[PDB]
């Protein structure tokens, strides 16, 4: 009472179960009404349509729109990692850890990077074979070591007691292991691009190795062993396939045309930039 100055989105949603129909349109002879002329300086795309440009027939369109949703586009398993467990003769560790980063393999990386923010679940399958290829009847242990948890120091070391860490016991002759994983980010979404630094302080101008590394993506480590006492002589790879499910996506961004170099960095060649479209002989020959 004594001091008065103290006292939405335009876009909406619509279900689309099939491709758009086409209504019939005849010609137009008159002034003042001009569907063709656009001005792109407003950042908005041309709203001109089939039916105001030419004369059209009527098309009932039963083409399905369904397969292109982000759920169906992103729910497929593809390789996020490869782990090499020697365990054999000579120098023998007896186990191998793999930090969980799905940016290590390009084919599934470029699909994710269409988007800035993502919130999903996961389905991991572990396909393990021997050096060339085979399956023998050896028991395996796949253990998840979340951030802050002790990493195992040896084949038999006590960190494999896994009274808490989830683990999978499986034989090489069994069908590949599989589990469901939740959304574990301490933020509200995963983000594949973080423009910023994780901590305060003075940042070197010569080499910034901390630029662009989001803390919220550090999920812990995956570790393998052969359950045993002495050692085996075999040598095996485990391939790791991640499926995305229940996925949501935000803020689409352009698709990367340059060859990747590093996992965690978008470094590209200042020399050698490859053109996004192949070159022809002349602009006047379509072919």
């Amino acid at each position: 009472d004594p001091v008065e100055d103290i006292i939405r989105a335009i876009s909406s949603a619509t279900n689309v179960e099939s491709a758009a129909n086409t209504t019939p349109s005849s010609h137009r002879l008159e002034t003042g009404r001009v569907p063709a002329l656009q001005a792109a300086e407003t950042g908005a795309t041309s709203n001109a349509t089939d039916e105001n440009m030419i004369e059209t027939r009527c098309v009932v369109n039963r083409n399905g729109v369904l397969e292109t949703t982000i759920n169906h586009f992103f729910s497929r398993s593809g390789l996020v990692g490869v782990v090499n467990l020697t365990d054999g003769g000579t120098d023998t560790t007896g186990y191998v850890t793999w930090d969980i980063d799905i940016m290590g393999f390009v084919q599934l990386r470029r699909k994710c990077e269409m988007f800035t923010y993502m919130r999903f679940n996961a389905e991991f399958t572990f396909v393990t074979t021997t050096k060339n290829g085979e399956a023998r009847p050896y028991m395996l242990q796949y253990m998840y070591v979340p951030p802050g948890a002790p990493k195992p120091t040896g084949r038999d070391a006590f960190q494999w007691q896994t009274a808490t860490n989830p683990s999978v016991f499986v034989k090489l002759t069994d069908p590949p292991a599989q589990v469901s994983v939740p959304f574990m980010s301490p933020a509200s979404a995963y983000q594949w691009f973080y423009d910023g630094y994780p901590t305060f302080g003075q940042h070197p101008e010569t080499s910034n190795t901390t630029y662009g590394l989001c803390p919220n993506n550090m999920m812990g480590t995956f570790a393998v062993r052969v359950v045993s006492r002495e050692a085996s002589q075999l040598k095996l790879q485990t391939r790791v396939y991640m499926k995305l499910k229940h996925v949501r996506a935000w803020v689409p961004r352009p698709i990367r045309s340059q060859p990747y170099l590093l996992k965690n960095f978008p470094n590209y060649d200042s020399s050698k930039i490859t053109n996004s479209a192949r070159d022809r002989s002349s602009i006047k020959q379509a072919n």
Binding site: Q191, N208, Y211, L261
Partner: peptide, 22 residues
């Protein structure tokens, strides 16, 4: 949104690979 600059160089080792300055 989230505009990340990028090192320019052919180095594929995260050690020898260049990064931009602050």
């Amino acid at each position: 949104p989230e505009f990340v600059i990028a090192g320019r160089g052919s180095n594929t080792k995260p050690n020898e690979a260049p990064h931009p300055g602050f």
